[PDB]
Structures are given as structure tokens and as C-alpha cells.
């Protein structure tokens, strides 16, 4: 009748990470579409009671950011 065109079964063949997924090339995914892999913090200082520039007896739990 009319000119045949490929289907989803044909389309998902060309769409892996490789063309011939074998035993070695099996655990391979396509990358994220914008080539951005997910990123997979701030310091927490505890200035204890050991220090003269704190006036005597003080414990300071800081949260620095650099």
C-alpha cells in the first residue's frame, strides 16, 4: 500500500550506549542528556574550652564556610 517506516522496536536498537550490546558492553547507560552528571558542604568547627582568647570557659561550635 504505502512506504513502510520503522517502529519503536527498530528505534530502540540504535539507542543504547553501544550498537552491539554484548557481555562486555552490557552495563553501559546513555549519559544525562545535557551531559550533567549529578554532583554525588560546610566545615563544623568545635572550639573547645582550651583557649585564652575566649574569656575563660567557653565552647564554640562554629559552622564555617571557608
Amino acid at each position: 500500500a504505502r512506504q513502510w517506516q520503522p517502529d519503536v522496536e527498530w528505534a530502540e536498537q540504535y539507542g543504547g550506549a553501544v550498537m552491539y550490546p554484548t557481555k562486555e558492553t552490557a552495563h553501559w547507560k546513555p549519559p544525562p542528556w545535557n551531559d550533567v552528571d549529578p554532583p554525588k558542604s560546610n566545615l563544623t568547627l568545635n572550639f573547645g574550652p582550651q583557649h585564652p582568647a575566649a574569656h575563660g570557659v567557653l565552647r564554640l561550635v562554629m559552622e564555617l564556610s571557608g
Binding site: 552491539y20 554484548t22 562486555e24 558492553t25
Partner: protein, 55 residues
Amino acid sequence: LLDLIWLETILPKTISLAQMKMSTTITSQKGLIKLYFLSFLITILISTTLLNFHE
């Protein structure tokens, strides 16, 4: 036997599966840079000792 199997096998299909398998041997690398620089060192060793390209 001849003209759907064996003449169809001996020239094109054996070559096609051979190129398939050799392409799987080429492109099945684990991505590891250590292995690639190790292969580069093996190349310089073979080109110094085996084929004597320094001559």
C-alpha cells in the same frame, strides 16, 4: 543450501560477524586511564626492542 545459506554465508556474513566481534574487542574498554598509559608504555617498549624503530 547454496543460494540462501552458503554463498550468503562465505563472503558477507562471516565478514560481518568478524567485524562485529573485532569492533567489540576494540570498544569494550573500562575507561581506565592507568590502562591506556600502560599500553602507551608497552608501545614504546615494543618500538624500542621488538621492531627496533630507533635504528
